[PDB]
Symmetry: C3
């Protein structure tokens, strides 16, 4: 398996775990009680540090239930935990509900951490994609809604 070394900076919280076999992420706990008014964010400690392997990345994603039920999100989602980072994972929670505050208690599961390979790319500067001998593509320079699919596009 791909092992991930982890330090429970706050040993009072359980180790992050998958809710079900095959789940992509292990759920991260809040070390803290925090209450977010509408529109407010906080930087919340999870009580863990990890050593993402070289060649990989840790990614902090919101949980869907809280997202829908109370509008909880993460400002920098997907949080990007670098392989060299040995500090505490912190989660930038934000309340995107307009009216109802969100109360987080220490020990709630407030996000999930995935680990994936990542390509540590070597940039090759060219003067044009033609010089790199790249074939023309279907997409070309099309983006930002170029394929349609909604009246505003």
């Amino acid at each position: 398996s791909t092992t991930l070394a982890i330090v429970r900076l706050d040993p009072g919280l359980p180790l992050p775990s998958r809710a079900h076999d095959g789940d992509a992420g292990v759920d991260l706990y809040s070390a803290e009680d925090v209450e977010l008014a509408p529109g407010r964010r906080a930087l919340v400690r999870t009580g863990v540090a990890v050593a993402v392997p070289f060649g990989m990345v840790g990614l902090v994603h919101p949980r869907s239930g809280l997202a829908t039920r109370v509008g909880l999100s993460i400002v920098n989602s997907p949080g990007t935990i670098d392989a060299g980072y040995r500090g505490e994972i912190k989660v930038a929670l934000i309340n995107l509900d307009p009216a109802a505050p969100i109360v987080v208690h220490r020990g709630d599961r407030i996000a999930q951490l995935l680990v994936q390979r990542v390509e540590l790319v070597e940039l090759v500067e060219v003067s044009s994609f033609d010089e790199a001998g790249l074939a023309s593509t279907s997409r070309g320079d099309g983006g930002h809604g170029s394929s349609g699919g909604h009246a505003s596009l």
Copy 2:
């Protein structure tokens, strides 16, 4: 190819497809008409269920055109569809424009689904990264803007 079994829970919608060869995602349709006032979210049915292979994850990402043109986003982006999930994919749309409502019609393309491998990690609890014999890293405990690049950091 990597096959993805899919059930069209709503057979009136086309199968999700890539807009162009090589595109990362297949676009998901809204099964529903929904109108989001500024700041409001909804949990929108896509009319599909999928079986992400074990060892992989499905990821629901916003489309860029709607993001810019009308401020449409996804509260839990990137939505994390687990390999064991066999329910309907639902998209937590949110209107991040301050003033203009977003109207979604059934059959609009409102998000995109990627599939990637994911490392199903085995946590190894250590008392310190030293005990794991890990070398010191350049980054160390630096994060949350430690490398600079903006006046607020």
Copy 3:
């Protein structure tokens, strides 16, 4: 290494680089000065175009420091740069702070670009997961907070 061809559409900006060895992303610069009032977004040029290899995807993620310090986010995060795209990478910045405007200067590092493999899936339509001979799963149709972990779930 995985090479990524890049055109500096704006040669006055440095090539994107990793802040530290092993970091997942290369930081993207703003080509532009832009000032975002609370709640406003902009579509910001980065001054680069890239050729993500076929079979891969580029992903534009927010930086964590700006996310926490000033509430900067990205409407379509994680931005999905397709392998066929040869246009300029643009970043849909948004100010999620309620009260303080964010000022971006040309040359600030405003996001980071990761490159990952992606599964270009072949959809296989089935009438039920049973027909595909898929085993029942632990998770079943559970989602959107089914595993608990917060009082609102």
